[PDB]
Amino acid sequence: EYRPSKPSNPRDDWKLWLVVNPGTWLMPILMAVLVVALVVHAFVYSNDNYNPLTFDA
Amino acid sequence: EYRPSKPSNPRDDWKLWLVVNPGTWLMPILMAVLVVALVVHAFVYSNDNYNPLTFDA
Amino acid sequence: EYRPSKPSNPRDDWKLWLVVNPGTWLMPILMAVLVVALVVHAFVYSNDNYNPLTFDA
Amino acid sequence: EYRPSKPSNPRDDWKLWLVVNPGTWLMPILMAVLVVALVVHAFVYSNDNYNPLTFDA
Amino acid sequence: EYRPSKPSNPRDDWKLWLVVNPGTWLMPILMAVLVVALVVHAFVYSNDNYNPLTFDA
Amino acid sequence: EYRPSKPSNPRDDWKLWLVVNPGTWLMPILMAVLVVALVVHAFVYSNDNYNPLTFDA
Amino acid sequence: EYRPSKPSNPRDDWKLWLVVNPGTWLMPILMAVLVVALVVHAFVYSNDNYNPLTFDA
Amino acid sequence: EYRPSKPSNPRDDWKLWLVVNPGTWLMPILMAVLVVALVVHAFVYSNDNYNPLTFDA
Amino acid sequence: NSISGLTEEQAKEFHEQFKTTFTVFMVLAAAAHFLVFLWRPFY
Amino acid sequence: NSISGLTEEQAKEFHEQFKTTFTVFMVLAAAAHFLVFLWRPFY
Amino acid sequence: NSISGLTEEQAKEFHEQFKTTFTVFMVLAAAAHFLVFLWRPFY
Amino acid sequence: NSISGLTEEQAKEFHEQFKTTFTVFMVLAAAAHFLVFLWRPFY
Amino acid sequence: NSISGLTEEQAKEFHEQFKTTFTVFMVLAAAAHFLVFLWRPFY
Amino acid sequence: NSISGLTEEQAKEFHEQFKTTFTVFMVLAAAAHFLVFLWRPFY
Amino acid sequence: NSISGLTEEQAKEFHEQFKTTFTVFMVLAAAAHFLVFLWRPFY
Amino acid sequence: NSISGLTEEQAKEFHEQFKTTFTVFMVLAAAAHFLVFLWRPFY
Ligand code: BCL
Ligand code: BCL
Ligand code: BCL
Ligand code: BCL
Ligand code: BCL
Ligand code: BCL
Ligand code: BCL
Ligand code: BCL
Ligand code: BCL
Ligand SMILES: CC(C)=CCC/C(C)=C/CC/C(C)=C/CC/C(C)=C/C=C/C=C(\C)CC/C=C(\C)CC/C=C(\C)CCC=C(C)C
């Protein structure tokens, strides 16, 4: 019966917080972003040509 | 006794949210998709012919 | 004293939801299946003969 | 004081569910069994003689 | 003021369940034991002389 | 309708605690920062030129 | 204002349980000790010389 | 309106427990410290010169 | 008064959708397998 | 009395946004796969 | 008053289904193991 | 009666701050990327 | 008033079953160590 | 009726201390980076 | 009104058992270290 | 009405024991570091 309207983004992006409580999930969000950053660094740093560790002997 | 009707998908897909509370599970869903992308990147990146790290010192 | 009747499967399979709340475990279930698929892909992909990464350079 | 009777197994095996709520722990049990399968597969798969990946490019 | 009596083990071992509810922790206990068996097998299986994988292709 | 005002940072940075309860999340924040430091140390220490382990038998 | 007295250890060690509920944390404590033993075994077992696996061929 | 005063450390360090409940977080703090020591040991132990395992068969 | 809190009708409707979705997933997995066998046979 | 607690309107509205966002994510993923095949072909 | 909250009837009925399911899983695993021994013997 | 319990104004204000912080994070990340390409070009 | 919430009878009787099952697990593990030493001695 | 449940005074007090601690951690980290560059230069 | 909720008697009784068990674990660990040094000396 | 729920006296008493234990842990760690440098010097 009910027919939801088509949402317009990014204008209705704020509605995500109506669904997802920031008090519970904002920190998990930041931690996930950090985990991505760590994983990406791990794959790039593993390449010896893309890390600053250049001390010889 | 009770015999449930055959669901029609994707017309009945919105019913998932009647079972799964998005307030609880939307962020875990996103993080799971993120974990998949990170694993997939790990396997493809690990192959030297499919990552952009082309600098040779 | 009580003697439970022998269940008939798959006819009584829906009773699992009477024990296991899908609102709380459906997403864990699907995440577990995904983990399995990642793990399987990880063992098969690691065989160079069974992945599409064919660029030679 | 109180002296518990010696249990008779497997006839008293159903009493486990009086302690362990299946609604909470049945999915964790199944996931644990799955993890065991995945670890056993990982150790046996890793032996090239015991996996079906037989294609030689 | 209060000075507790010296416990006698294993006679008083049943008092642990007064402290730790089995309904919450029995499954965690079993899962930890399983993890331990898995790690032990990992380390012994890794030794080729102590696993049954003897087929040679 | 309601139009939120553009926040001024770092002046409004304290408002984060109105959303994120420090009693719940301060410890996991610190543990996250510790994990980052462990991961960075792992990558830098792995380079023999950047760890203090200089003894040779 | 209030100035706490210097505690005397190990006479006051029992007060830890007034802070830490053993109902909740005793099993995590024991699991942490188990993890430590596992990690220590993993580092010492990895040394063949400190390994009971002496079967060859 | 409110303008918090500059805290004085370590004089106000006890106030952390007014934010962080020790009953919930003391054990996680202890576990984290243990994890750090295990990781540090892992990186130092891995270097055979800083390793007490000296037996050679 | 079910352990999960679900009524019989809720459990039955959920099971019906779960079975349908599982069946599609299984068909697709079988397709995918046949297809990877065509691309690179195993065993 | 839904299992999740959501009303029908809530579930439908959330699903509508979910679907829209998923569609854009998929279009972008298809774009990225096309670009990565152009850069480094596979199979 | 049980620790888990289950009645005796619920625990018995759950155990009966669990046993049936475990038994089929065990039979299937035994078949898988003879099968894998036929394909690649071990020990 | 929102799912997350937030009011409309709370959600809007949080989103406004989240957007602002995300934008600065974005700008710093783009600057880090150029910068790392200056130091060691990729592709 | 017990920390776990269990009564003395419940604790005793859980402990009696736990000991029973632990003893059988231990006998089985000892048999397994004996068999594995016969198959491949260690030390 | 804040989301976290903190009053404005509590949030401000906690932030003041968090900032102070963070600043000291940062100065310590900067000193450590200077010392490690002295010991083993990078880049 | 303790943080953990335990009475003084409960905390003392638990600590007494914990100390006794810890002492036995430590004695066994010391014996194990002595035996492992006899079997394979370290340092 | 503290965030943690602890009173001022509880927080102070806990901090005093926390400090004391931390100090002993630190002195033991410093002794450990001195002994390990004697056994195998680093840097
Ligand atoms: C590996 C190849 C290159 C390199 C290339 C890149 C590139 C390219 C990028 C980084 C990025 C970063 N790298 Mg790197 N980097 C290298 C070597 C290092 C080393 C090292 C041991 O040598 C370290 C420690 C770092 C560390 C860092 C971080 C400072 C940063 C990722 C932040 C993050 O986790 O966001 C994810 C975590 C979170 C979002 C959680 C929240 C953390 C805080 C709250 C973020 C605050 C946001 C807000 C806008 C801040 C406002 C205040 C500001 C003062 C304005 N790099 C080498 C030299 N690095 C990224 C970056 O700069 O991002 C901005 C980035 O795009
Ligand atoms: C799963 C839990 C819920 C449910 C909740 C949702 C939600 C929530 C959503 C959907 C969405 C969809 N649902 Mg539904 N859905 C359910 C069960 C079903 C059933 C069913 C009979 O069981 C059906 C038919 C559908 C149908 C659909 C689709 C119409 C749609 C997803 C399209 C898609 O991603 O395709 C798959 C397309 C791909 C996988 C593309 C693959 C990318 C390629 C392969 C990349 C590789 C490139 C490389 C070159 C390939 C190599 C070449 C060779 C091929 C190897 N749903 C149950 C009831 N469903 C979404 C939707 O409506 O979006 C508009 C959505 O957001
Ligand atoms: C997802 C959950 C919510 C929601 C919540 C939020 C929140 C919360 C935020 C946004 C934000 C945004 N939202 Mg919204 N949003 C949703 C769904 C949508 C939909 C949609 C139809 O589904 C749309 C169109 C948008 C639109 C947008 C954007 C306007 C904006 C993010 C910009 C951005 O990051 O670009 C992506 C740009 C990049 C990824 C840059 C990548 C960096 C480069 C690529 C580094 C590589 C360098 C190297 C040289 C590259 C190699 C070269 C070759 C290309 C390979 N949202 C749903 C409803 N949205 C943010 C915003 O408004 O910010 C102002 C924000 O904070
Ligand atoms: C590695 C050496 C051999 C091999 C030897 C074996 C052996 C030996 C066994 C398996 C078993 C399994 N193998 Mg293997 N296997 C190989 C390669 C593979 C590959 C692959 C990528 O090549 C895959 C994907 C698999 C997959 C699997 C699963 C189908 C199964 C373990 C299930 C599980 O997780 O149970 C644990 C998880 C759970 C219990 C959770 C619940 C899962 C479901 C819900 C259980 C349903 C039970 C119910 C009674 C089913 C009723 C319906 C039936 C139609 C009757 N094998 C190679 C060829 N494989 C096992 C098996 O068949 O077990 C039955 C087994 O004993
Ligand atoms: C993120 C969640 C909250 C919030 C909560 C907090 C909290 C809580 C705090 C802050 C803090 C700060 N906030 Mg705020 N903050 C938010 C969003 C913002 C926004 C914004 C527009 O979004 C801004 C501008 C700021 C601004 C700031 C800064 C004034 C300050 C952090 C300084 C800092 O660490 O710099 C970053 C500086 C560095 C990373 C130095 C790095 C050192 C070098 C790089 C190490 C490598 C050395 C090696 C030689 C380098 C190689 C050479 C080449 C460069 C590669 N915040 C949101 C609203 N913010 C802190 C504060 O006030 O402290 C006083 C604080 O405690
Ligand atoms: C553990 C928690 C609960 C409990 C809950 C449950 C539940 C729940 C179930 C059982 C089940 C069973 N329980 Mg009970 N049970 C408990 C305590 C006990 C005690 C006891 C005295 O403590 C006993 C004797 C039993 C007895 C039993 C069995 C009758 C049955 C499991 C059969 C089985 O899997 O065998 C072991 C069989 C094998 C190990 C198969 C081995 C396959 C081989 C080894 C594969 C390798 C092949 C390869 C070639 C071998 C190589 C050669 C060399 C041998 C190496 N339970 C406690 C109280 N019990 C199940 C049942 O009733 O099923 C009908 C069931 O579902
Ligand atoms: C963090 C959360 C809380 C808080 C809660 C607590 C708690 C709880 C405690 C403290 C403790 C302390 N707090 Mg306080 N504290 C906070 C914020 C602060 C601030 C601030 C302005 O932010 C300050 C100045 C302090 C000050 C202090 C110190 C007096 C003390 C820790 C000493 C220490 O460990 O030194 C660091 C010393 C070392 C790390 C020694 C390292 C040894 C060497 C380096 C090992 C390597 C050897 C090898 C040879 C080295 C190589 C040579 C070269 C150097 C490389 N706190 C906030 C408010 N604080 C503790 C205390 O009072 O103890 C009595 C304590 O228990
Ligand atoms: C720990 C938490 C609780 C408590 C809860 C429980 C519970 C619950 C149980 C017990 C059980 C036991 N408890 Mg109690 N227990 C507590 C504290 C104590 C204390 C004490 C003073 O602290 C004591 C003395 C005991 C005593 C005992 C034992 C009688 C018994 C376990 C026997 C066992 O496993 O042996 C150890 C035997 C082995 C480890 C063998 C391992 C196998 C061999 C080593 C395999 C290797 C073979 C290879 C060839 C060896 C190489 C040769 C060289 C030697 C290297 N408990 C506290 C209060 N206790 C159990 C019981 O009564 O069981 C019937 C039981 O289920
Ligand atoms: C930590 C949280 C609580 C608390 C709760 C508890 C609890 C709970 C217990 C104790 C226990 C003890 N507590 Mg208290 N305790 C606290 C704070 C303190 C403080 C203090 C001033 O902070 C002190 C002095 C003590 C004192 C003590 C000891 C009397 C005792 C532990 C002895 C021990 O393990 O030695 C350490 C001995 C070892 C580490 C030996 C390790 C094995 C060896 C090293 C193996 C290597 C061999 C190899 C050859 C070595 C190589 C040679 C070279 C040396 C390298 N506690 C706080 C308040 N405490 C326990 C107790 O009373 O037991 C009777 C106990 O159960
Ligand atoms: C080599 C190798 C390791 C291969 C692995 C192969 C494997 C296993 C791959 C797995 C592939 C899978 C399996 C991927 C899953 C991808 C996925 C499944 C993506 C889903 C995306 C979803 C979105 C991006 C949607 C987000 C929707 C939002 C955020 C809606 C927010 C709603 C509102 C704001 C409405 C407000 C409502 C009110 C009532 C107020």
Tab-separated table of C-alpha atoms in Angstrom, chain C residues 20-57:
chain	number	residue	atom	x	y	z
C	20	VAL	CA	16.739	-18.515	16.772
C	21	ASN	CA	15.560	-14.945	16.500
C	22	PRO	CA	16.216	-13.899	12.888
C	23	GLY	CA	16.275	-10.225	13.843
C	24	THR	CA	19.420	-10.948	15.859
C	25	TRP	CA	21.090	-13.699	13.888
C	26	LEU	CA	20.142	-13.381	10.210
C	27	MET	CA	22.915	-10.862	9.614
C	28	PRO	CA	25.526	-12.922	11.557
C	29	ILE	CA	24.422	-15.917	9.451
C	30	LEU	CA	24.990	-14.068	6.182
C	31	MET	CA	28.290	-12.653	7.424
C	32	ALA	CA	29.396	-16.176	8.298
C	33	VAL	CA	28.494	-17.408	4.796
C	34	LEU	CA	30.479	-14.463	3.361
C	35	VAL	CA	33.454	-15.338	5.539
C	36	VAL	CA	33.281	-18.862	4.176
C	37	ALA	CA	33.206	-17.567	0.624
C	38	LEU	CA	36.175	-15.256	1.292
C	39	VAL	CA	38.134	-18.150	2.834
C	40	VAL	CA	37.338	-20.459	-0.079
C	41	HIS	CA	38.262	-17.771	-2.600
C	42	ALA	CA	41.439	-17.183	-0.639
C	43	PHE	CA	42.558	-20.813	-0.950
C	44	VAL	CA	41.497	-21.111	-4.619
C	45	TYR	CA	42.721	-17.664	-5.769
C	46	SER	CA	46.104	-18.352	-4.195
C	47	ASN	CA	46.525	-21.016	-6.879
C	48	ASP	CA	47.723	-18.939	-9.837
C	49	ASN	CA	45.976	-21.348	-12.210
C	50	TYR	CA	42.557	-20.515	-10.707
C	51	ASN	CA	42.488	-16.715	-10.678
C	52	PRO	CA	41.824	-14.289	-13.552
C	53	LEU	CA	44.977	-12.213	-12.896
C	54	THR	CA	46.718	-12.995	-16.181
C	55	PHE	CA	48.475	-9.724	-17.057
C	56	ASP	CA	52.121	-10.579	-17.704
C	57	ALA	CA	54.116	-7.319	-18.003
